[PDB]
Design a protein around this ligand. Structure first.
Ligand code: NLP
Ligand code: MN
Ligand code: MN
Ligand code: NA
Length: 261
C-alpha cells in the first residue's frame, strides 16, 4: 500500500525507536554476556523507557523480544540465558518495535572482542550490500533490479545471498506486501512508487547460500555452518529517492537519499 504523510511520520517515530534500541545495546555486547540478558535489556528499554512494545513477542509464537543470531546462525536466533558471547563472535541483534500502531524494523552486526579478519570482512560487505540497495531506491526502479544488484555485489565480493528470507513491506502490519528479495528472481515485478514503506535486510553467507531450519521453527543456520551476516533498515520511498527511518549514529550513509540535482 501507499502510506500517507501521517502514516510516514508515525513510522519515523517507530523506526527511530528501533534504531535507538540498537544504539543503546551496543556497550552490552561483550564477551561473557548472555543473549538472554541482552534480550531483557532491550525489552526493558522498549517497554519502560520508550513506552512501546516488541512486535516479536508472540508473533507466530516467538518467545522473546528481539532476535539475536550468532556466527553460523542466519536469522531469528532466540535469546537464551545459557548462551554466552565470546571473542570473535559476530552477532546480529534484530529489533522490531511497535509505537502508535506502526512498526520499526532494523538490525546490525556486532563483533565481540577481538575480531576475526573474515568476520569483519563478511559484516563489511553485508552492510555495503544494504547501502548499495538503499542508494538505488527511488520511484521507477523495480524491486527485481534491487535484488539483482545486491546479489551481483555480494557474489562479486566472494559471498552468497540467502534466498529463503527477504525484506518486506511494513506499516501497521509487521510484514506486508511486497516481498523484497535480495537476489534476482523472475517472480519479482514491482515498480517502486512514492509512499511505499518496506525493509531491505540481506543475509549474506561466507560460504554457500543453503540454509537449514532448527527444530524450534525459528533458528536458521547455514547448511555448511559458515558465517552469516545481516543488516536491516526500514525505509519509505520518496518522490525522488528514499528516506531511511531506522538510521543510527554509526551508519555511514545519510537518512535521506535524493537523486535530484
Ligand atoms: C520474530 C520475527 C522476527 C522478524 C524479523 N524482525 P525480520 O522481519 O527482519 O525477518
Ligand atoms: Mn528485523
Ligand atoms: Mn524485517
Ligand atoms: Na550469523
Amino acid at each position: 500500500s501507499i502510506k500517507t504523510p501521517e502514516d510516514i511520520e508515525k513510522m519515523r517515530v517507530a523506526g527511530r525507536l528501533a534504531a535507538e534500541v540498537l544504539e543503546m545495546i551496543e556497550p552490552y555486547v561483550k564477551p561473557g554476556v548472555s543473549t538472554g540478558e541482552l534480550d531483557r535489556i532491550c525489552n526493558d528499554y522498549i517497554v519502560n523507557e520508550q513506552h512501546a512494545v516488541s512486535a516479536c513477542l508472540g508473533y507466530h509464537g516467538y518467545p522473546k523480544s528481539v532476535c539475536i543470531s550468532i556466527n553460523e546462525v542466519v536469522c531469528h536466533g532466540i535469546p537464551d540465558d545459557a548462551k554466552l558471547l565470546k571473542d570473535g563472535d559476530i552477532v546480529n541483534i534484530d529489533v522490531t518495535v511497535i509505537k502508535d500502531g506502526f512498526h520499526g524494523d532494523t538490525s546490525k552486526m556486532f563483533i565481540v572482542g577481538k575480531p576475526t579478519i573474515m568476520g569483519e570482512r563478511l559484516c563489511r560487505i553485508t552492510q555495503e550490500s544494504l547501502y548499495l540497495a538503499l542508494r538505488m531506491v527511488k520511484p521507477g526502479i523495480n524491486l527485481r533490479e534491487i535484488g539483482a544488484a545486491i546479489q551481483k555485489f555480494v557474489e562479486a565480493e566472494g559471498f552468497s545471498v540467502v534466498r529463503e528470507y527477504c525484506g518486506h513491506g511494513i506499516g501497521r502490519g509487521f510484514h506486508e506486501e511486497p516481498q523484497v528479495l535480495h537476489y534476482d528472481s523472475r517472480e519479482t515485478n514491482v515498480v517502486l512508487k512514492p509512499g511505499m514503506t518496506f525493509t531491505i535486510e540481506p543475509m549474506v553467507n561466507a560460504g554457500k547460500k543453503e540454509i537449514r531450519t532448527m527444530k524450534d521453527g525459528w533458528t536458521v543456520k547455514t547448511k555448511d555452518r559458515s558465517l552469516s551476516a545481516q543488516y536491516e533498515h526500514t525505509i519509505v520511498v520518496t518522490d525522488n529517492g528514499c528516506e531511511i527511518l531506522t538510521l543510527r549514529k554509526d551508519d555511514t550513509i545519510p537518512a535521506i537519499i535524493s537523486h535530484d540535482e
